[PDB]
Amino acid sequence: GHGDLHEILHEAVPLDANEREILELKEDAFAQRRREIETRLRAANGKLADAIAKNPAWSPEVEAATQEVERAAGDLQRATLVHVFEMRAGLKPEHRPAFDRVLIDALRRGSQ
Amino acid sequence: GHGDLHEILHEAVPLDANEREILELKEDAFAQRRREIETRLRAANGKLADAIAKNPAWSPEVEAATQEVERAAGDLQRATLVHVFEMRAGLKPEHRPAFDRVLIDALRRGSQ
Ligand SMILES: [Cl-]
Ligand SMILES: [Cl-]
Ligand SMILES: [Cl-]
Ligand SMILES: [Cl-]
Ligand SMILES: [K+]
Ligand SMILES: [K+]
Ligand code: NI
Ligand code: NI
């Protein structure tokens, strides 16, 4: 699937009042990072479209753009999962098993 | 976005009767290949979920599973685009510009 892992967790197992206070800095930092990587992904998609518009064949331009798409997507996957682990570190320990239930099940469905 | 590039093209700019005859072998080969890579992707997602269920931290298991997910996703992206180019080779030349319009626009939206 194509689930939004970060959103799934904040919606299904929301932070409590104190956890939200604790996590606010790291949540903001991640929001900025997600936006930056998404800007790169959109730009890479645009380079791939441009390449195929110019010359609709595998080509150096397609090879480079495909790699750039892949790299941005992987950066986003990894950054998101690192931030999921930040969230878990900021939870009260007793909240971690429910968080993990949602996380595990969502990962198995391909959420990222 | 998360568009299904292959489906978008077959639905919006379907093959004509003779093109469909010409392309049937390669379409079947691609259907089998897509299924194989998707099976690998589902398995990788399951290894990632398993790893986090065991030990919810970045870990060798998470590193390996993340890489395996990435590899399968990239294999699927590339295989799909190679097959899109197979489709284009099997079109009557006069059908290629409409095909390309749909392809370019969909790529710019992140369809894969
Ligand atoms: Cl929340
Ligand atoms: Cl819990
Ligand atoms: Cl078709
Ligand atoms: Cl045309
Ligand atoms: K993930
Ligand atoms: K693509
Ligand atoms: Ni968060
Ligand atoms: Ni096809």
Side-chain angles (χ1 to χ4, degrees):
Chain A
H2 62 61
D4 184 333
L5 181 60
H6 191 227
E7 184 177 85
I8 285 162
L9 289 159
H10 278 280
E11 291 188 352
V13 282
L15 304 183
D16 79 17
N18 190 69
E19 290 163 342
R20 181 179 175 90
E21 294 176 10
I22 288 179
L23 273 158
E24 181 273 332
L25 280 171
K26 289 182 192 179
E27 292 291 338
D28 184 46
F30 178 68
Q32 305 315 318
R33 184 63 183 142
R34 179 175 181 163
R35 174 192 45 78
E36 289 164 353
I37 302 164
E38 287 172 337
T39 293
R40 285 171 44 213
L41 184 51
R42 291 190 295 275
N45 291 339
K47 291 292 191 181
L48 179 55
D50 288 351
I52 286 169
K54 290 177 186 184
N55 167 35
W58 211 279
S59 69
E61 301 93 350
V62 165
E63 178 66 34
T66 290
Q67 284 174 9
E68 189 174 307
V69 170
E70 285 167 348
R71 189 174 323 112
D75 289 351
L76 183 58
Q77 167 211 225
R78 292 190 304 274
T80 302
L81 189 59
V82 169
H83 172 64
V84 165
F85 297 135
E86 293 172 345
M87 292 173 58
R88 194 183 185 281
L91 294 179
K92 293 178 169 64
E94 59 270 33
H95 290 157
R96 297 174 185 149
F99 183 92
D100 289 354
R101 181 199 75 234
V102 171
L103 172 56
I104 296 157
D105 288 0
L107 288 167
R108 206 162 286 296
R109 299 185 305 264
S111 299
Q112 297 178 324
Chain B
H2 62 61
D4 184 333
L5 181 60
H6 191 227
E7 184 177 85
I8 285 162
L9 289 159
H10 278 280
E11 291 188 352
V13 282
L15 304 183
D16 79 17
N18 190 69
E19 290 163 342
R20 181 179 175 90
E21 294 176 10
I22 288 179
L23 273 158
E24 181 273 332
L25 280 171
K26 289 182 192 179
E27 292 291 338
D28 184 46
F30 178 68
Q32 305 315 318
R33 184 63 183 142
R34 179 175 181 163
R35 174 192 45 78
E36 289 164 353
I37 302 164
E38 287 172 337
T39 293
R40 285 171 44 213
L41 184 51
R42 291 190 295 275
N45 291 339
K47 291 292 191 181
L48 179 55
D50 288 351
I52 286 169
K54 290 177 186 184
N55 167 35
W58 211 279
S59 69
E61 301 93 350
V62 165
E63 178 66 34
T66 290
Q67 284 174 9
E68 189 174 307
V69 170
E70 285 167 348
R71 189 174 323 112
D75 289 351
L76 183 58
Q77 167 211 225
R78 292 190 304 274
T80 302
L81 189 59
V82 169
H83 172 64
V84 165
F85 297 135
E86 293 172 345
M87 292 173 58
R88 194 183 185 281
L91 294 179
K92 293 178 169 64
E94 59 270 33
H95 290 157
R96 297 174 185 149
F99 183 92
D100 289 354
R101 181 199 75 234
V102 171
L103 172 56
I104 296 157
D105 288 0
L107 288 167
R108 206 162 286 296
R109 299 185 305 264
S111 299
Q112 297 178 324

